[PDB]
Amino acid sequence: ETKCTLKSFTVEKGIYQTSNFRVQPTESIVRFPNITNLCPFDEVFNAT
Amino acid sequence: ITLKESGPTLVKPTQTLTLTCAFSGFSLNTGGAGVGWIRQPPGKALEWLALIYWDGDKRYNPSLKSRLAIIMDTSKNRVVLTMTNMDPVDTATYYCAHHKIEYIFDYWGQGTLVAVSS
Numbered sequence: 001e002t003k004c005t006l007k008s009f010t011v012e013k014g015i016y017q018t019s020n021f022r023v024q025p026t027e028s029i030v031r032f033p034n035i036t037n038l039c040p041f042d043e044v045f046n047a048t
Numbered sequence: 049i050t051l052k053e054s055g056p057t058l059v060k061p062t063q064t065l066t067l068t069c070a071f072s073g074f075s076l077n078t079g080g081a082g083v084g085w086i087r088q089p090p091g092k093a094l095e096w097l098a099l100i101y102w103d104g105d106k107r108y109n110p111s112l113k114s115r116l117a118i119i120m121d122t123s124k125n126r127v128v129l130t131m132t133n134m135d136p137v138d139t140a141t142y143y144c145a146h147h148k149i150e151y152i153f154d155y156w157g158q159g160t161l162v163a164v165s166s
């Protein structure tokens with residue numbers, strides 16, 4: 001990387017710079033609110 | 049589930065049969081279900097008698113409309129089956145049962161037998 005960032009086959013002494021140190025996540029967490037006020041489709045299909 | 053049947057053991061030919069059956073525990077939030085009555089004498093097979101639904105419909109076998117009456121308590125306690133002007137071949141036993149349309153008779157009662165005193 002310190003060769004490919006200068007387009008040269010030889011690099012001199014000293015401190016250089018490269019790409020950043022990236023930490024990636026693993027999984028996804030989705031917590032929307034608890035179900036409530038269920039719609040009354042249960043009573044209309046089970047209606048007498 | 050308990051369905052108990054009550055009635056006389058011996059009756060007069062000029063009397064009236066007053067059978068009762070009491071049911072304990074059902075899902076009343078339904079449609080097409082009800083209470084059915086069926087008759088059985090020894091020496092020949094079963095003969096269906098009557099049906100009631102929860103809405104108060106009142107049905108029997110055909111050509112027996114005049115001599116069959118039902119009393120509903122409208123309190124989910126008991127169903128009363130009343131007959132007048134009997135036939136002495138009908139000395140028989142009675143089963144009161146739950147009556148669905150897919151389940152032809154859902155739960156079988158114990159039933160009660162009666163014979164004429166003549």
Ligand SMILES: *[C@@H]1O[C@H](CO)[C@@H](O)[C@H](O)[C@H]1NC(C)=O
Pocket residue numbers: 042045046
């Ligand atoms: C009716 O109620 C029952 C529970 O008694 C439920 O399982 C069913 O999903 C409801 N819907 C129908 C079949 O109408």
